[PDB]
Nucleic acid binder design. Structure first.
Lengths: 154, 127, 214, 81, 181
RNA sequence: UGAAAUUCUUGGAUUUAUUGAAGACUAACUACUGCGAAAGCAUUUGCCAAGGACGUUUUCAUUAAUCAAGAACGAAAGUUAGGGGAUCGAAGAUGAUCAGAUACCGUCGUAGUCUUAACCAUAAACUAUGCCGACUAGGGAUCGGGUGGUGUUUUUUUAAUGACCCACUCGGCACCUUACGAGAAAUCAAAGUCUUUGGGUUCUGGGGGGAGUAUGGUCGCAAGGCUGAAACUUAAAGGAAUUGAC
């Protein structure tokens, strides 16, 4: 929430010059294949141009909010990246199938079908369907699923 | 002779319960706590507060008029310590001191045959 | 607002005929208003009592008899036998550290069609002329003694009825049968019947309770 | 134990040693001529009989195998060798 | 107006019982005015009070505490101080109540609580103004409620693997901050 | 809880009593012990298939010992796919606070902890002590088997069981002395029979770091495992025992 305060900041200011932890600044400007790379770098390079300037350990960074903000829902971006980056050492298919993620994302997906009126079948996922297998299939329907969180870009 | 009751003394590390019941576990007759007696947060389970609560219990039993009690002192049991503390000891000292009839002293502590995992972890729980 | 002891009600329980001192304890039933509900409250009463306090023997003889209360008649409450137990400190005084514990068990039906379960314990003693400071029995002896005790208990409880089981159970009959027939396998001591557990009861009977009262 | 004889051990001490561990090794067992009264007949039985040696005519178990030695039947005459 | 309590005797404690019985019973009979009987067959000490004796119902409880603490392995004079002082109580804990130990871990824990020649334990009893029975897996603490609490802190310090030197440091800290007040 | 604050409680918590469901464990008994190649194994009863020791006036007659190559098993944790999910609980989400009494802690809690089908192959996997074999002091306890006793007791009339006691014998797990001898010492009945140096055989090490690192090969989905350096740097790093001075 350190960087994230001045991302969603309404009436976005001109620049941002601030000094933080050097390890946290490495979390900022990390490239997509690191252990340094996590949710935060994809968030910032989605919504804020970032540059490291004059390392003071500590380090100073300059942030610029993209004033034509890219229309990506940061809430779903938050939840998706949070789930896939909590389990970075775990396979992506097994991580959605925990017990409660199969309940929390189940309720979130049926809330996501409240304005769609899709008939939840009796087949719903323990054998072949929406709780177990369809979430596995949507991963294989996008750039994800067998790729890992530290290999997919934004 | 006297009217026999059932006294039940629970001894948690923070608290002392004294609980007078009729025969067969019928209904609660006299029931106070060291917490509701002494307002000092240090003194929530002192032997002093236990004796005060036990004399309150004795007073309410004499208000009812029931004198004899079959007393069942009880530790935490389960996985914590299975010997009732000095709160229960001073409660017994007070119920003897208050002149109530004591039918039978028994130490009913729930002992597990074979316990599950405690809340101490591998390290040890407290201190 | 109002004290319950204003409306609280006082009753009196009485023990069955198999035992001596039938006048044991009284009851506080907090309402006399709903006497259907009061009768139902009295149907679910269970009193555990001492053997000594019920049979007048002054030695606080370490047992415990559970009595379920069933019927109501003019402040006097008719009871039924429900179980047997020891006290905890007796068993903790019994179990010692250089002798061998032997426990046996049996699932039981009794001639009054009661489903029951019976727990017997027996330790091992050491003889007069010992030099070993311990007396462990081989495990074949333990299987044999469990088998003998199981069969003795099974026949002894399938013969009798429930009150007949109680009447055998008071003067320590069954453990002397175990003492006799089990002596030929390994010499034992402290042979007792630890717990007795009702499991299932027949269709609801009343006249047997009145026979068990008088 | 400095100077003793091992060629000629005392027969009592030599009697207690293990079968394999004597001066010259050799068995501690023997044979028997037994007679059951129901036949008046000599049956030759080894002292450590591993099978139930039944008599010739009658179905009478003259000895049962129990651990080391065979337990003779009740009421049976015997003599060594 | 008699009142009768019975307490069992284990044979582990029965030999000091039958040795020091001649000092045990007369202060209960004379100095505390209680009727004291012994069934050596059932190993049962029977404390009953009569209308002859002084009506002190707390004296029966303190006599039961006397016989119980001697049964728990405590000394004669400490239990006589229990007959004198009221604020002295008994804690009793297990090793496995605090930390699960197995085999020689238990033995080494008991040795670290005791120390060589009891020098770890005895230095506790001087500095906690308590008395401790270290039973097989049981610990028994005898003293004031704050004092048995501090002894509980010390023994829980010892049982979790902490070295005895840190225990001496915390011990002299608690002793200095308690004797000053 | 050193101390305190979040949560729940007037619809009643906590505690008391009567029940019911779920899954996990197998206390005390439990050592002064047993089994298993080790890891490991403590409720009853049954089935199956093994195994040691003992006994043997049974059989074969060198069929053996140690083992690169190769092969099975291998705690805990961890990976994939089902089932389960009560306890506790790496992460996480959280209320914190009060002293420099150290860090705090506390409540919820996903993974996991439990099984099935597979993967992995590591421990202070220690008894820090390869395996086979002989010889060299005692002593008293036990565990399994066996041989004796005009022993003892339970007497069933005598017996026979059993159970103890005594004496002997194997085969164990342990103990306690000594020193003949060993060792630097603690200590060791083997760590002895070693300068008076040889029973057989497998593996390993050559001052300390750099470093179990780099690279290559191989095994694995992954995590990792096995194998495994040099450059460079340095006079100590150590093991055991001993004294008293902040």
């Amino acid at each position: 929430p350190l960087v994230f305060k001045l991302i969603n900041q309404p009436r976005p200011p001109r620049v941002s010059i601030l000094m933080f932890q050097r390890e946290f600044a490495l979390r900022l400007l990390a490239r997509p294949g690191d252990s340094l790379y996590c949710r935060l770098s994809a968030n910032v390079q989605m919504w804020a141009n970032v540059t490291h300037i004059m390392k003071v350990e500590s380090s100073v960074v300059r942030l610029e909010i993209k004033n034509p903000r890219p229309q990506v829902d940061y809430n779903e971006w938050d939840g998706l990246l949070r789930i896939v980056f909590v389990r970075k050492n775990r396979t992506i298919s097994a991580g959605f199938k925990s017990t409660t993620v199969m309940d929390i994302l189940e309720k979130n997906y049926k809330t996501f079908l409240a304005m769609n009126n899709e008939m939840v079948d009796d087949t719903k996922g323990s054998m072949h369907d929406v709780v177990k297998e369809k979430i596995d299939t949507v991963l294989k329907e996008t750039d994800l699923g067998d790729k890992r969180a530290g290999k997919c870009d934004q | 002779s006297q009217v026999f009751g059932v006294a039940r003394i629970y001894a948690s590390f923070n608290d002392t319960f004294v609980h007078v019941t009729d025969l067969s576990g019928k209904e609660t007759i006299a029931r106070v706590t060291g917490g509701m007696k002494v307002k000092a947060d240090r003194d929530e389970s002192s032997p002093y507060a236990a004796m005060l609560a036990a004399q309150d219990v004795a007073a309410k039993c004499k208000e009812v008029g029931i004198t004899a009690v079959h007393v069942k002192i009880r530790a935490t049991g389960g996985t914590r310590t299975k010997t009732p503390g000095p709160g229960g000891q001073a409660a017994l000292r007070a119920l003897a001191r208050s002149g109530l009839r004591i039918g039978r002293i028994e130490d009913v502590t729930p002992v597990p045959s074979d316990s599950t995992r405690k809340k101490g972890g591998r390290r040890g729980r407290r201190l | 607002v109002v004290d319950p002891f204003t409306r609280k009600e006082w009753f009196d329980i009485k023990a069955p005929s198999t035992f001596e001192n039938r006048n044991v304890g009284k009851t506080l039933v907090n309402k006399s208003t709903g006497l259907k509900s009061a009768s139902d409250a009295l149907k679910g009463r269970v009193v555990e009592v001492c053997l000594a306090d019920l049979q007048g023997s002054e030695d606080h003889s370490f047992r415990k008899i559970k009595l379920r209360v069933d019927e109501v008649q003019g402040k006097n409450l008719l009871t039924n036998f429900h179980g047997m137990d020891f006290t905890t400190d007796k068993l903790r005084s019994m179990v010692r550290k250089w002798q061998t514990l032997i426990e046996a068990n049996v699932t039981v039906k009794t001639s009054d069609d009661y489903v029951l379960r019976i727990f017997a314990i027996a330790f091992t003693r050491k003889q007069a002329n010992q030099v070993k400071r311990h007396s462990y029995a081989q495990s074949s002896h333990i299987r044999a003694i469990r088998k003998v005790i199981s069969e003795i208990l099974t026949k002894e409880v399938q013969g009798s009825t429930l009150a007949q089981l109680t009447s055998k159970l008071i003067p320590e009959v069954i453990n002397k049968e175990i003492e006799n027939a089990t002596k030929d396998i390994f010499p034992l001591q402290n042979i007792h019947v630890r717990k007795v557990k009702l499991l299932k009861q027949p269709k609801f009977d009343v006249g047997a309770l009145m026979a068990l009262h008088g | 134990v400095l100077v003793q004889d091992l060629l000629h051990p005392t027969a009592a001490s030599e009697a207690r040693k293990h079968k394999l561990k004597t001066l010259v090794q050799g068995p501690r067992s023997y044979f028997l001529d037994v007679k059951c009264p129901g036949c008046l007949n000599i049956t030759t039985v080894f002292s450590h009989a591993q099978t139930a040696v039944t008599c010739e005519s009658c179905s009478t178990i003259l000895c049962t195998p129990t651990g080391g030695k065979a337990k003779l039947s009740e009421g049976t005459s015997f003599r060594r060798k | 107006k008699f009142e009768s309590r019975k307490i069992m005797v284990p044979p582990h404690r029965m030999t000091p019982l039958r040795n020091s019985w001649t000092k045990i019973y007369p202060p209960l009979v004379e100095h505390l005015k209680l009727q004291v009987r012994m069934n050596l067959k059932t190993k049962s000490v029977e404390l009953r009070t009569n209308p002859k004796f002084t009506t002190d119902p707390g004296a029966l409880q303190k006599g039961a505490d006397f016989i119980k603490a001697f049964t728990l392995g405590f000394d004669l004079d400490d239990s006589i101080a229990l007959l004198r002082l009221d604020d002295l109580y008994i804690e009793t804990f297990e090793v496995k109540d605090v930390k699960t130990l197995t085999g020689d871990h238990l033995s080494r824990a008991i040795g670290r609580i005791a120390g060589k020649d009891g020098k770890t334990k005895f230095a506790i009893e001087n500095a906690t103004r308590t008395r401790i029975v270290l039973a097989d897996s049981k610990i028994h603490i005898l003293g004031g409620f704050t004092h048995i609490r501090m002894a509980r802190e010390s023994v829980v310090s010892l049982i979790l693997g902490s070295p005895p030197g840190k225990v001496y440091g915390n011990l002299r800290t608690v002793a200095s901050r308690l004797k000053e007040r």
